[PDB]
Amino acid sequence: PHMPTEVILRGYRNAQHQYAAINHYEQIAGRICEDYPREPPVESRALTPEERAKVNRAMSGEHWVKVTFESAEAADKAVYSSPQLIQGHLVYAEYYKGVPPAQDEAIPD
Numbered sequence: 001p002h003m004p005t006e007v008i009l010r011g012y013r014n015a016q017h018q019y020a021a022i023n024h025y026e027q028i029a030g031r032i033c034e035d036y037p038r039e040p041p042v043e044s045r046a047l048t049p050e051e052r053a054k055v056n057r058a059m060s061g062e063h064w065v066k067v068t069f070e071s072a073e074a075a076d077k078a079v080y081s082s083p084q085l086i087q088g089h090l091v092y093a094e095y096y097k098g099v100p101p102a103q104d105e106a107i108p109d
């Protein structure tokens with residue numbers, strides 16, 4: 001009942017644009033348990049054990065990031081609504097299978 005469920009988000013421009021993929025899919029599909037930024041950097045001078053276990057298996061690359069939705073139904077929403085046009089790129093959501101995606105490039109729209 002609310003099994004945290006891991007999803008790969010992939011296709012955005014570079015690692016400095018990861019935040020938009022996370023924010024956009026979180027707003028569509030539901031809470032993402034990782035604490036990654038949802039906004040660009042700002043200028044300046046609790047998890048269950050199941051959620052925490054999956055959050056701590058962190059993975060990302062230049063154009064993809066693994067996220068943990070708090071339930072399978074939320075993960076399902078993300079995959080169903082994939083792909084999403086985000087900041088000029090097609091960002092896909094796919095269920096995580098314990099490995100990095102075999103498609104790990106930017107996908108410009």
